[PDB]
Design a protein around this nucleic acid. Sequence first.
DNA 1: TAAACTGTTACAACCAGTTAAGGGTTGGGGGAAGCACTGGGTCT
Length: 170
Amino acid sequence: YAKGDTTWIHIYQIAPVEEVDMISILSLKDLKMHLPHYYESNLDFLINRRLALLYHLLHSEALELFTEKEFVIHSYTLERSGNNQAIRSFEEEEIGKLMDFLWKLKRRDFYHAIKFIDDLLKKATEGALALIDAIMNERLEGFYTALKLGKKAGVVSSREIVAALEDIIC
DNA sequence: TAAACTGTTACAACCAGTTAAGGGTTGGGGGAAGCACTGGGTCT
């Protein structure tokens, strides 16, 4: 995600812990998605880097219980503001917790979850920032405000979405 | 010259009737969501 002059790239590599197999290897190969250039108009609502990261992680995959062995993720980021490249994040949890939240949200449905997230990103930008503030610096009430903007966005707000959110709440 | 004896301490009905317990009108507008500073390679 690049904004005019600044350019951000976040690579999150997957590593094993005990053992893997070719099924796991090919599953990780299938995890590779989100082709380089997907920018036609979405940037008009992407604005914040975290929001764009969440939107792009929406189209990614979040299933790892298939391989019979669970995985771990290490994420590193690179920035380029004014043609200056360096590292500002080598081991940060926000990708991991965002990925876990996405996995636990869309487990109860993918069609309604996709519709909800897409609608809030498109028109309920306040709700999108509210959700990212509920994930970044985790505070549960922010989720509610996002859902509030959902009614401002005409979101269907299916039964299973709030159930998945409550399961995330624990 | 004596200093209240006694039945009696209310009965009975009844102990809110109805009507509605918000009507409406609006549920963040609107801007921004890092500005630089720190450049990594490959060559001479």
